[PDB]
Amino acid sequence: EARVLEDRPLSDKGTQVSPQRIALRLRPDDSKNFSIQVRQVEDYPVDIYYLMDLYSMKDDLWSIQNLGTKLATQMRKLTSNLRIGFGAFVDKPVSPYMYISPPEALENPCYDMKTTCLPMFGYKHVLTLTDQVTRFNEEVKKQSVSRNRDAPEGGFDAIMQATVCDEKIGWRNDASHLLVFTTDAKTHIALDGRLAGIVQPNDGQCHVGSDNHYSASTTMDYPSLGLMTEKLSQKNINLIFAVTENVVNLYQNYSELIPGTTVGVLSMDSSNVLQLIVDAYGKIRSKVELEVRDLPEELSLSFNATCLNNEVIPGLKSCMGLKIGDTVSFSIEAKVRGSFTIKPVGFKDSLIVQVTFD
């Protein structure tokens, strides 16, 4: 049987899944049917953590000088709780990535072109998620750029640390999380660290201390596409690849390996990031897909999506064709042959299925 045991209405404006705690009870070698009802709530709170990459991106800093105000003017038209954060990364400050050759390049890595630059840093958390959009502006003016010898950078370290650090970044427990990722170069994927002498795998723990720097840059290797995926779904974070036109195809293929990621064509000076993010909101909340945790090994479940207008799509667990928010339903079977959680990707609401075998 399947006792509902809990059900609250799909909330009108900013509860998303209708049944909260079903009470499955299976005789061996049998299967019954579930129920689900997603509701993309309009005007849901939004948090945007602007993870930027700063030498070829020095013009981007000037072109996004007033971004928080332009964000607020064009984001409060679809939400009422908006928070902005800022973080930066270049690459690990270790040997085969940074200019340590001249004795004065540790302090000024750009002592070749006759200018000034910041010493290279691994990951920097600058601004926590605040509702004050002017703090974004006044903190982004105090940002300069650094220089790295290699072409690939430490982007995945920054994404990982932003995802796992929760008090430092201040992702709300009840919010729609957007992570922006703007860069114009490739990335040093996992295992790109024994060239630098780093062979200790990433653990997932967050090491941004009170100094706001990733303290394990020269001690731990880059994260992989599995550790990142395992942590991007645990904390329900959506990642947007605001990359240039020379890295779009590269980051599109990484995107089609992690659920909940998209790409955007970031201009040469990040002069179209507002429209990019706004369109990325309508491309992140337009897709509803379901993912499972802690499924018993002796259980197998099918997924019959019923979306659009009373469709009978036989097998898909995800639906395309949502504009802002729609009420779609997926039926479920579950065979035993002798707590498991159903939840959408990017949201905390779930159907906690209670299973008791008799």
């Binding site: 040997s95 085969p96 340590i100 050759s101 001249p102 010898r149 290699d150 072409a151 690939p152 490739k186 994927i189 996992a190 295992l191 790109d192 024994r194 060239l195 630098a196 002498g197 062979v199 200790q200 795998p201 992989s224 596409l225 599995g226 550790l227 995926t229 590269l250 293929n253 990484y254 390996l257 499972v292 197998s300 479940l301 667990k317």
Partner: protein, 520 residues
């Protein structure tokens, strides 16, 4: 299945010194011993003014089990007063350690030096060669082609492998804007053209790859290397892994051992899977050709329902006479186990007539202590299912134990007829040795009530003359004819071999075959 687990040889080292990052045997053609060359790339030497240079240690097998290291005993050299030339500190001496007869090639990839022209630091990479009483330094990438545009950031000695004709092959994945490079020089040329005053040596038989276009930028050619025949002649060919090969998919290049032309290329399937992290060339089906084994520890297999889980993947390619390859992939077992990290050939582990291979997952199993898988090849390829499971025994201390990240096989240290395996666990800075127990095969018999139960046995290598079995129905000579007795519905008999008496001085208890039954 024949590897011992009960009593393995252990080998410790300095704390946090990465003892076991490189493991290799040391068989000399000048004596009657077999030592263990184990590298500790983060150890502290007695060189004055050098911190964490690293060292390579020789470990005795039949002794008090002591371990003692001297490729160099000098500090930084001086190019003009008040400024040094090289900086051997934190140089990772011991990241690679190879051996062939009385030759020991130990390299420090993260070695820096001040190029004569500017005043800078460049990880060119350094190596050291020892042929007995003569030890020499080998730095092919320490040339006048400087900076990242040349061989300045070469990281030479990252991966090395000897050649059957003494044509050692070097891979440095940072040469020419990290496009990667491979360098092969004769051992005769290395020792002959060696001075302590000439920094750049041009040699004469320099087989080196040259720079390509900017499309192949940051590809890391030279991550791993191997030697094997793939053109048809007698000269071994260089197989190298390119994990970031221009789309991070991963490619593997096979060059030639004579003029170094592009012979064969492989390509990966999943991006950021590291197709080419480790390579190994051997024969797994006994056709006298050379097979290839490319590891992809970060491959993300599609799970049962719809999920992608990272388990690792090793690609098995079988050489054919026409040059084409037959490819078959075997996926990892555990999640985040890095299966396909250290593929070490073992030779004839059980002397079944076909060579066997070892694939290790350094971060998989119980408490992620590392597990080594053993595979035995047939004349169809190799068995998909593992033949033995090896497990770590030391819990992680600060660092992951990383058991199985470094391995080396196909060498008999007992001279007992079966080769042996050495496994390095640098996280717990331990090195371990497993001895292949001898293998016996038994053919059974059992052809008023008249019953007659027969049995005979045989094996290879060192083995006691007579084996005491134990048979009950409900001493047999090794190599003799069918010995049996006759004494006067299902009738059941079993033969349980007496391992304890069939042991030897150390004990090396023999093992029975794999497919043989015991109940009839």
């Amino acid at each position: 299945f024949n590897l011992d687990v009960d009593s393995p040889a252990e080998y410790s080292g300095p704390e946090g010194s990465y003892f076991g990052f490189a493991v290799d045997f040391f068989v000399p053609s000048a004596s009657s011993r077999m030592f263990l060359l184990v590298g500790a790339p983060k150890a502290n030497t007695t060189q004055p003014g050098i911190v964490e240079g690293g060292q390579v240690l020789k470990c005795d097998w039949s002794s008090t089990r002591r371990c003692q290291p001297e490729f160099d005993a000098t500090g930084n050299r001086d190019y003009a007063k008040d400024d040094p030339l090289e900086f051997k500190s934190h140089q990772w001496f011991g990241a690679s350690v190879r051996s062939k007869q009385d030759k020991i090639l130990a390299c420090a990839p993260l070695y820096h030096w001040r190029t004569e022209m500017k005043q800078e630091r460049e990880p060119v990479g350094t190596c050291f060669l020892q042929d007995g009483t003569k030890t020499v330094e080998y730095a092919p990438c320490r040339s006048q082609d400087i900076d990242a545009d040349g061989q300045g950031f070469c990281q030479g000695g990252f991966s090395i492998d000897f050649t059957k004709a003494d044509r050692v092959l070097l891979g440095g994945p940072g040469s020419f804007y990290w496009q990667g490079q491979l360098i092969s020089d004769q051992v005769a040329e290395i020792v002959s053209k060696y001075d302590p005053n000439v920094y750049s040596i041009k040699y004469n038989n320099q087989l080196a790859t040259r720079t390509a276009q900017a499309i192949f930028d940051d590809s890391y050619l030279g991550y791993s290397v191997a030697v094997g025949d793939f053109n048809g002649d007698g000269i071994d060919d260089f197989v190298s892994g390119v994990p970031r090969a221009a789309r991070t998919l991963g490619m593997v290049y096979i060059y030639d051992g004579k003029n170094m032309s592009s012979l064969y290329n492989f390509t990966g399937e999943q991006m950021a899977a590291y197709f080419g992290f480790s390579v190994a060339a051997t024969d797994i089906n006994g056709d006298d050709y050379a097979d290839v084994f490319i590891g992809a520890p970060l491959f993300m297999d599609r799970g049962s329902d719809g999920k992608l889980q990272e388990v690792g993947q090793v690609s098995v390619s079988l050489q054919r006479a026409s040059g084409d390859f037959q490819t078959t992939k075997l996926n990892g077992f555990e999640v985040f186990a890095r299966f396909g990290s250290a593929i070490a050939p073992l030779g004839d582990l059980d002397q079944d007539g076909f060579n066997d291979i070892a694939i290790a997952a350094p971060y998989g199993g119980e408490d992620k202590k590392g597990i080594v898988y053993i595979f035995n090849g047939r004349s169809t390829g190799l068995n998909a299912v593992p033949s033995q499971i090896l497990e770590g025994q030391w819990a992680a201390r600060s660092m992951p134990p990383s058991f199985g990240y470094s391995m080396k096989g196909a060498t008999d240290i007992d001279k007992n007829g079966y080769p042996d395996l050495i496994v390095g666990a640098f996280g717990v800075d331990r090195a371990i040795l497993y001895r292949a127990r001898p293998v016996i095969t038994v053919n059974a018999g059992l052809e008023c009530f008249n019953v007659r139960f027969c049995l005979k046995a045989d094996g290879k290598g060192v083995l006691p003359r007579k084996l005491n079995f134990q048979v009950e129905l409900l001493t047999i000579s090794r190599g003799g004819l069918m010995q049996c007795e006759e004494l006067i519905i299902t009738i059941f008999m079993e033969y349980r071999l007496d391992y304890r008496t069939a042991a030897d001085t150390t004990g090396l208890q023999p093992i029975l075959n794999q497919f043989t039954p015991a109940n009839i």
